[PDB]
């Protein structure tokens, strides 16, 4: 356990984490201790730079929208959906294969359509 008690936790996208990692990095610029990021944290930063497929803000918004789409999409699954950005039914299948409930073709297409916005275009 970190600290005395955990009061709150959220599942976060790679895109959101990219923003936070860059913040941590830029804090150093910290002078008195400088405070370098340890090796795997810097590795994490690089990975996140490469694999954040959305901008920080559109990632959040898409995460919220996917959550409000079905009860069986919780925060972890929505964050995964955002990170992966599934294109078709096969992508949805593998994401949900080990989950509580498996989206039928139709609800799968609803997700894909919601995710069909936000898709980078560039």
């Amino acid at each position: 356990m970190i600290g005395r008690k955990k009061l709150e936790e959220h599942y976060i996208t790679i895109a959101e984490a990219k923003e936070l990692l860059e913040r941590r990095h830029a804090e150093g610029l910290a002078e008195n201790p400088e405070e370098p990021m340890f090796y795997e944290a810097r590795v994490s930063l690089e990975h996140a730079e490469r694999f954040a497929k959305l901008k920080p803000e559109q990632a959040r918004e898409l995460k919220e929208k996917l959550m409000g789409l079905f009860d069986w999409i919780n925060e972890r699954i929505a964050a995964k959906l955002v990170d992966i950005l599934p294109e078709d039914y096969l992508d949805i299948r593998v994401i949900f294969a080990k989950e509580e409930y498996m989206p039928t073709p139709e609800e799968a297409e609803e997700i894909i359509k919601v995710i069909d916005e936000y898709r980078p275009l560039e």
């Binding site: 356990m1 970190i2 600290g3 005395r4 008690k5 955990k6 009061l7 709150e8 936790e9 959220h10 599942y11 976060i12 996208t13 790679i14 959101e16 984490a17 936070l20 990692l21 913040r23 941590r24 910290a30 008195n32 201790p33 405070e35 990021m37 340890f38 795997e40 944290a41 590795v43 994490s44 690089e46 990975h47 996140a48 490469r50 694999f51 964050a79 995964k80 990170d83 992966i84 294109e87 078709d88 096969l90 992508d91 299948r93 593998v94 994401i95 294969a97 080990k98």
Partner: protein
């Protein structure tokens, strides 16, 4: 699998940092304390992000430090069992491939690459499937599923992640795209 935690804790701010704003000081102490570890319950501790609240300082007899209670935000990352992940091949060995996924690497063994007969080609440092001429090399990008996790120590390096790409919708991105509706050309 990144997560954002909100944690309450007790911090000791040393005498040598008394001219520092309490929140700033606590943030540093909490970084020295927590960043760079693997927490068995939470996973890789990547960053103390900020200190939201810090209580009034308490002094104990026999010590010039001030003790506070603090509430702060922590970025962590965990390898979860059966979790779908994506990453870059960062090492080729004869027995498999390390994939950056990415504060830790995940091992895909040569038998868990693809539904094919696979040999390692030493000359070119790559895997080739016999029937499907699918090739995996250093720097390739893949989707995989985590299949086993070994969380031993507080040290990241010693912890182990095992994965597969031997499932529908997994593997090198080139394989996946050619798996798709070009194999639903019906």
């Amino acid at each position: 699998m990144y997560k954002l935690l909100k944690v309450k804790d007790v911090v000791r701010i040393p005498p040598r940092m008394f001219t520092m704003d309490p929140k700033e000081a606590a943030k540093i102490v909490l970084r020295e304390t927590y960043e760079g570890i693997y927490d068995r319950d939470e996973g890789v501790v990547l960053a103390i992000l900020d200190v939201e609240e810090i209580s009034e300082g308490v002094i104990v007899p026999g010590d010039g430090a001030t003790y506070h209670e603090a509430i702060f935000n922590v970025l962590v990352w965990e390898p979860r069992n059966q979790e779908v992940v994506e990453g870059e091949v960062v090492e080729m060995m004869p027995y498999g491939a390390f994939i950056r996924i990415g504060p830790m690497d995940g091992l895909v063994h040569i038998s868990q690459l693809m539904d094919d007969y696979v040999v390692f080609d030493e000359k070119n440092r790559q895997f080739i499937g016999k029937e499907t001429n699918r090739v995996l090399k250093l720097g390739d990008y893949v989707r995989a599923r985590i299949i086993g996790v070994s969380v031993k120590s507080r040290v990241i390096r010693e912890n182990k992640i095992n994965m597969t790409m031997r499932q529908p919708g997994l593997g090198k991105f080139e394989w996946i795209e050619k798996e798709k509706k070009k194999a639903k050309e019906e």
